[model samples]
Target: HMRLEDLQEELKKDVFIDSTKLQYEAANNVMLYSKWLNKHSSIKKEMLRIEAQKKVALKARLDYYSGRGDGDEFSMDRYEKSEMKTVLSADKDVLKVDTSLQYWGILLDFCSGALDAIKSRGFAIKHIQDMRAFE
Candidate 1:
């Protein structure tokens, strides 16, 4: 079993010294990425749902303030602060998800290339083995 941390260290190197070992490492990374993609997708859905609810609540508050006859400066100021706070909080949550998704997207692309390399290497290895067997 290849650990992600170890794979990460390998990834940082410019060259992979061992083909077979790198193939296994690439396969492991692909598996781990797929699992994370599923988990993050579910989390994204929940985050969107919660954000929608919060927006609706904020709109309702705005409507209430608009309908009020007495325009109190203090109350309006308080509402503005609260509204800004809620909006920023929601934006931050979404940003966190966006950043994670972006990072994973790049990793997935890298793994795909690695897998392609592994496939070609596998064919070459088989061909070499066959030649040696005949000799």
Candidate 2:
């Protein structure tokens, strides 16, 4: 019974705010979600996609920020943000929205949607592996 728009908004509010601490937490959520779906063929595949995409974005972030050290903080943030747009755009297309979140939150939307579908089918996650066998 969950709507995509609503879930996307909740994602931005709960996990994808502008704070560094929040972004770090959202990345953790992605890791946990990926772990939860480690056994599900479909979910695992998407999670891998998210992971790869995140890595690319992370690289961009690193190149722009720490590459030149802290004295260049302002320019680094702007440069990294600009560089991030390209890689991040690919993942954004998965959700077809212009909002922002750490790579984990971006990927979690797909995982969450899959879980919602399973629930609608009257299915329950009896065990960690139950989801993998859902089809």
Among these predictions, the greatest lDDT belongs to 1
The CA root-mean-square deviation of candidate 1, after full C-alpha superposition on the true structure, stands at: 9.0
Candidate 1's residue-wise lDDT over 1-135, tens digit each? Answer: 223455456444522434446546445545544544554465456556655665655554444444443334223444554465455445444455445545545555555555555455556555655676799
Every candidate's lDDT:
0.50, 0.45
* Clash count (model 2, backbone only): 0
RMSD, candidate 2, Å: 17.3
Clashing pairs for predicted structure model 1, backbone only: none
Pairs clashing in candidate 2?
none
The TM-score, computed over Cα atoms with residue i paired to residue i, of candidate 1 is: 0.37
Per-residue C-alpha lDDT of model 2 across residues 1-135, encoded as one tens digit per residue: 234465456434533333334435444554544533542344346556666756665555454444544335433234454665564455434233323334345445565664444343222223323544576
The alpha-carbon lDDT assigned to residue 19 of candidate 2 equals 34
